[PDB]
Design a protein around this ligand. Structure first.
Ligand SMILES: CNC(=O)c1cc2c(Oc3ccc(I)cc3)cncc2s1
Lengths: 268, 345
């Protein structure tokens, strides 16, 4: 565990700059909703969340690095249009940059490209007819743009750590953590990480886990000093995600949705 | 492949280091990190001196990445503050901007050691307190420095931060947090005996060394210069100063990878009349001073018996006259020379 800056969230760039207003986000999104429906935009985001996950697993990265790379991606496109940079290029760039914020091992250039090439063909050929078309020099170029445009904000906080402390506090690690952890993973298929402090997301995921497993934790939740209204908002987003998940067939739909994307304009 | 419009818009808005800052010929530091220049705003009438750091190599390396990642978040008066990052796409170089520190402990201690051919009363104490303050802030955020030495204890010159310590050049990237992955005067004995990981205590040892050097103007574990962590002569120097640890002093020493090597090379009896007390007595430091007792608590052989930075800040040393001051120069005229520029090719 890379515990750098762990107790500093309330003074962090994450909190001070990258907890966004839901309306500002929705307004910036409009330019891309000229081409895509709100539903199709969400489906795209889910899709690339899954792409980043697959790349990370392939490179044997711990979940924390993958989550960080996922947030970079979300942050970039929260601000800039899908057409600004090919997300097929952005996704591996996020993984690459995130992996460098850690010092326990390095992703070489060949291993990153080989991983991008291999994951897209074997796991995502339903969305992509052609092989991965970018070379490492494109990744490096994209990486500079990504760093610049995130205002060099690299340290990202995630729900996993507070979740661990909460289930420990409950004394219910065996029963609840696997399910709650998995629900944290699922929240990255939504905008929650741009809107809420991660401990709130942890609590919402722990709550849903408790409900799924018919574990009464009302007294424990009462003993907390938190805005429970906010937690309920988060829970509702989680419940909505699962309904979208049910109605979404990304393998059947994503080629169509990708073709609708606005594409980068070439130079004249 | 980017959007053309997106690309030329970003190109048009991009702050370029050579447009904003004058630093041609104003190099003040060179090293493995890269180059450091004294810089001034070309436009905004700052009349404020800056430090421009061009990071070694191209692209963003693990070293570069982690340095930016952590400096982007760390905020403390005694830790050098990152003002801006410039990314130069053409040559793929990274530039970091800092407020400029006229002075550092390497040059300040050197200036004194030459004068054998600390003048304000509480300067030494003030320096140490601020060093401890800064390292404590890092440690509380689970950030190790890992390369502490006089040369990167900076001190601000004339200006609104006159005499304020700035800890710089944190060893932000170490593979697997290991010393074993690519002088030793400031290295803790566990490092020299094959410690696998940097620790808080290893920084505290280095602070102890710095404190002793401030008191005497001499590096306490001075040794000859130049992959394997074991360095015989450096251990010899430490034992010549500290004495050779008893079993009860450092019970876990047996767990160090190089312990058997130490045994093969060193006899306890070689150092029987060696102690920090005798060492400091030869350099006119009173062993019953609060200063000495605190120094002894920093320079503990066994890392787990070494005082923490917070416990050090609470030492009654700092309650004794003269008290630590925000300005280590305490209003006094700064006699130290300004930095000379490097015109070497
Ligand atoms: C790796 N070095 C650095 O990160 C920095 C060097 C300096 C500096 O110049 C110095 C030049 C030589 C020495 I020795 C120490 C500082 C003056 N102000 C700020 C900084 S930040």
């Amino acid at each position: 565990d890379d515990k750098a800056m762990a107790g500093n969230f309330w003074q962090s760039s994450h909190y001070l700059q990258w907890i966004l207003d839901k309306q500002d986000l929705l307004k910036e999104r409009q330019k891309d909703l000229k081409f895509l429906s709100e539903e199709e935009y969400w489906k795209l985001q889910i899709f690339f969340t899954n792409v980043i996950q697959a790349l990370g697993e392939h490179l044997k990265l711990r979940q924390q690095v993958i989550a960080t790379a996922t947030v970079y991606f979300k942050r970039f496109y929260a601000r800039y249009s899908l057409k600004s940079i090919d997300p097929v290029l952005m996704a591996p760039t996020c993984v690459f940059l995130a992996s460098k914020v850690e010092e326990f091992g390095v992703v070489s250039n060949t291993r990153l490209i080989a991983a991008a090439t291999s994951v897209l063909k074997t796991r995502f050929s339903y969305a992509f007819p052609k092989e991965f078309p970018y070379r490492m020099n494109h990744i490096l170029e994209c990486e500079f743009y990504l760093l610049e445009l995130m205002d060099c904000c690299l340290i990202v906080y995630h729900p996993y750590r507070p979740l661990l402390q909460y289930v420990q506090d409950m004394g219910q690690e065996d029963m609840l953590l696997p399910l709650a952890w998995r629900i944290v993973n699922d929240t990255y298929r939504t905008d929650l990480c741009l809107l809420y402090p991660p401990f709130m997301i942890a609590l919402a995921c722990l709550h849903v886990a408790c409900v799924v497993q018919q574990k009464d934790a009302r007294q424990w939740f009462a003993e907390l000093s938190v805005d429970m209204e906010k937690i309920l908002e988060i829970i509702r987003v989680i419940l909505k995600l699962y309904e979208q998940w049910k109605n979404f067939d990304e393998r059947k739909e994503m080629a169509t949705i990708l073709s609708k994307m606005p594409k980068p304009k070439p130079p004249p | 492949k980017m959007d053309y419009d997106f690309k030329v818009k970003l190109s048009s808005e991009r702050e370029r280091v050579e447009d904003l800052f004058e630093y041609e010929g104003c190099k003040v530091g060179r090293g493995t990190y890269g180059h450091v220049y004294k810089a001034k705003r070309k436009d905004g009438k700052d009349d404020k001196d800056y430090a421009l750091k061009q990071i070694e190599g191209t692209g963003i390396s693990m070293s570069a990445c982690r340095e930016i990642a952590l400096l982007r978040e760390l905020k403390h008066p005694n830790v050098i503050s990152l003002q801006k990052v410039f990314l130069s796409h053409a040559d793929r170089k990274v530039w970091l901007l800092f407020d400029y520190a006229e002075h550092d402990l390497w040059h300040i201690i050197k200036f004194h050691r030459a004068s054998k051919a600390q003048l304000p009363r509480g300067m030494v104490k003030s320096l140490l307190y601020q060093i401890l303050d800064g390292i404590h802030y890092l440690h509380a955020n689970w950030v190790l420095h890992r390369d502490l030495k006089p040369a990167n204890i900076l001190v601000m010159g004339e200006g609104p931060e006159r005499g304020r310590v700035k800890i710089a050049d944190m060893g932000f990237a170490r593979l697997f947090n290991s010393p074993l992955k690519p002088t030793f005067w400031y290295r803790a004995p566990e490092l020299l005996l094959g410690a696998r990981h940097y620790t808080k205590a290893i920084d505290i040892w280095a602070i102890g060394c710095i404190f002793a050097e401030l008191l005497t103007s001499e590096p306490i574990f001075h040794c000859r210069q130049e992959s394997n962590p074991y360095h015989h002569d450096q251990l010899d120097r430490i034992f010549n100063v500290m004495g050779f640890p008893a079993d009860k002093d450092w019970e876990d020493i047996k767990k160090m990878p190089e312990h058997s090597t130490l045994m093969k090379d060193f006899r306890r009896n070689t150092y029987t009349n060696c102690s920090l007390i005798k060492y400091m007595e030869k350099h006119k430091v009173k062993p019953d001073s609060k200063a000495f007792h605190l120094l002894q608590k920093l320079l503990t052989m066994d890392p787990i018996k070494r005082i923490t930075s917070e416990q050090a800040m609470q030492d009654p040393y700092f309650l004794e006259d003269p008290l630590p001051t925000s300005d280590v120069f305490a209003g006094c005229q700064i006699p130290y020379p300004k930095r000379e520029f490097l015109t070497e090719e």
